[PDB]
Design a protein around this nucleic acid. Structure first.
Lengths: 52, 106
RNA sequence: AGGAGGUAAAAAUGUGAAAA
RNA sequence: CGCGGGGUGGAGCAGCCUGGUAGCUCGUCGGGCUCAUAACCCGAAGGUCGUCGGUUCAAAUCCGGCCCCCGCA
RNA sequence: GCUCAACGGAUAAAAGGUACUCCGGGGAUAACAGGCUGAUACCGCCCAAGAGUUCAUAUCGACGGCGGUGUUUGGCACCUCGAUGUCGGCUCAUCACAUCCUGGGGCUGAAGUAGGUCCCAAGGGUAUGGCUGUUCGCCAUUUAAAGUGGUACGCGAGCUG
RNA sequence: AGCCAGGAUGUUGGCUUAGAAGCAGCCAUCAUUUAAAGAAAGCGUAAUAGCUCACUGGUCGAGUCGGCCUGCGCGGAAGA
RNA sequence: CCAGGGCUACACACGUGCUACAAUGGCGCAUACAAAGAGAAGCGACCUCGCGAGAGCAAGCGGACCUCAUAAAGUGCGUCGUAGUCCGGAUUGGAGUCUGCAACUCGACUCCAUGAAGUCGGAAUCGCUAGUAAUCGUGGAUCAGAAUGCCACGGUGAAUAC
RNA sequence: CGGCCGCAAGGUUAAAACUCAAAUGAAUUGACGGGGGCCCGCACAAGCGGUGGAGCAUGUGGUUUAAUUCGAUGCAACGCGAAGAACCUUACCUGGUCUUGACAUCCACGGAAGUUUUCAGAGAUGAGAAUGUGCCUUCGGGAACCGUGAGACAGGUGCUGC
RNA sequence: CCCGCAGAAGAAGCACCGGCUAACUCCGUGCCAGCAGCCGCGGUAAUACGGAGGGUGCAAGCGUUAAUCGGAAUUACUGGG
């Protein structure tokens, strides 16, 4: 089940070309990347993972 | 850092630093209330797009690492012997000696 | 011009995406 | 439900036997070397010795109870 | 005083194997069988939540308890070591009932039919092969059923090895 | 103790809002009219109606009913 | 838009500087010698008070003139006499001045006391050939207040380049 | 694979399935070489003084945190932006507030503006008691100035130096 | 085959649009969903992915797939090393 390691599952794309975080499972977009790297993970479960 | 905000202590379990830098495989022990339930959903593989310094021609090369979450809790095997089986067979087996014996073995 | 003698032990490696 | 080996840096072996006084290898931290790493070189913290007790100016040490593993039955 | 491994010390100098074995003895002492016993095994009852849709008395039944039979393994050495001389198969059986079938009945969550469970009953019947040295056991194909045990783990002065 | 009747008015009792009506499910465990009836065990029980025991009178009307201390017995008790 | 706080947080490592580990030196008294700069809601005589930072009166100058401004090393002499010492100086308690609404987090400076590390630095590594290295002192910009940071000048003044 | 040959090892003859859109030859311009010749430079050689060893100053990482803004981050970042963080600065955080706004133009309105100053208040702000009551008049008001209704917008030290 | 009435009334889609190969923009998603015959695009400023409009080619046909040949002088007698 966890075999897809490489270019298979792109759950949360973290880019630095424009510094934008996108969890495509829903589409919770955030332009505040650095804070997400240090705490803003709570928002991913409550919003995106709320419906699953 | 997210776990500290959740009061969970992130106990290190396993790690392996690379020959040049970075860790290859790392696992930790998060202890607390609603730790797994809230992380049971986070078994995804995040995608990283970052400017690469290791590549001399500093260009954005993608990077991948998988986030796997398992409860790790384990309560197992005690006793499974029941009375609905055990066809107990007690049959003999002969042996040896010196003149005329049947040294049996049930 | 013709032609000889003296003259270097060890040092591996760098994944992957850009040219009107 | 007998006899015995052992529990020493994070890991692995002497040091005990004949009572004070624990060395070294790997690892860890950093520096320098190359743009980076390894390697190399230098410096250094880190082990009172599973646990409890007696003896002595002094016990990880000599010995014994409890727990884990191993040899033969 | 070295000195008595066994410490009244066979001289203070001393290990093993024997299945050709041999001799002298023992059922004073073992293995098979019988005997006393019945821990264990086996079977049968008592109290009784729970499981089971609801309800424990359709069934099973934990927690524990009370007895029986003498078929498992054992316990003790009573009988035999101037012999009880062998496991299985073959042939031939015979008894018990705690019944595999067939018969007669009770209950049901037994509609019908087919089953499950319990009581009475021994009259008669209760497979053929593959594999194994086999009992047991697994498989194949049946059958109404392919019963559980005792009878020196029946039977070798009947056969085989 | 058998027998002949009664065994009820609100209570279609709250209900965790289509529900269990003495009765798989938890409860206060009612005030009443009375020679009289516990809002409670079993049956069909999803819930009914209904059949019972508590309880109340008429008949049989003498020893009766519930227990205890003990003797002797039955079942439990099935093998070649 | 605004008060307060942080940017100065601290079990750690590294880069970049000031001063020493002493006696070619420290302490004390007397004392000679500079260039370049800044000045007004500014720099500040002289003088007065004190151990000091500074307080007060306040001419001169919006400037080769006035002020900042006493240059410091060094020299003569005396003391200490090779120590963790009178070399060195952080930390720390207390009492002050400056600017500012305000000095606590969080300033500079001063006075008294205290007074360690450090006894010339490992592997390794950096700058320099000229009035350069090394070394002492001064001014300015920045600035309400306040640097060892930066810019600039002056004093002293080598060796080696086979 | 088969045939043949050979004592064996193997040799000889000789495909395909499949996979990619390249493989390859000479040569050209640079780059690079523990290739070479020559030359240059504190590269090293010859000396001198430092760093790392110590106290402290300052920056960053790390850690921490409400934030301890952000950027620079081999040579050519790290006494750097910052020619200087107690408020300010400040782009940060928390709290409290205004929200066509702090800066600015157009449509429409009243009022000289301003000022002494009080209460609540940390401040931002709200609500006042009054003095004053001005340049000029298309005189139902042109204009420095304050506030206000509202439609256009303003502002952005928010991101992107790929 | 011819004559009469009739409402334009009953009668238009397919492929492609970076280059090869005639012909374009915007928006949505961002090496994800997808495209393709080939070279290669999609990695937050896509003439190529999807939709909308427009345009190009063909036209009751239009694409796609399969197959033979030429292109292939890459089996060369013609006509190669």
């Amino acid at each position: 089940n966890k075999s897809d390691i490489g270019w298979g599952s792109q759950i949360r794309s973290y880019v630095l070309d424009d510094s934008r975080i996108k969890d495509l499972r829903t589409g919770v977009e955030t332009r505040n990347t650095q804070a997400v790297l240090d705490g803003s993970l709570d928002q991913f479960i409550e919003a995106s993972l709320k419906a699953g | 850092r997210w776990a500290e905000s959740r009061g969970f202590k992130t106990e290190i379990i396993e790690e392996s630093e690379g020959e040049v830098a970075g860790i290859k495989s790392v696992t930790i022990k998060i202890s607390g209330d609603y730790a797994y339930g809230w992380l049971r959903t986070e078994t995804g593989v995040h995608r990283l797009v970052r400017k690469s310094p290791f590549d001399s021609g500093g260009r954005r090369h993608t990077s991948f690492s998988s986030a796997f979450v398992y409860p790790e809790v384990d309560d197992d095997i005690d006793i499974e012997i029941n009375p609905a089986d055990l066809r107990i067979d007690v049959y003999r087996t002969s042996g040896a000696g010196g003149q005329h014996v049947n040294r049996t073995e049930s």
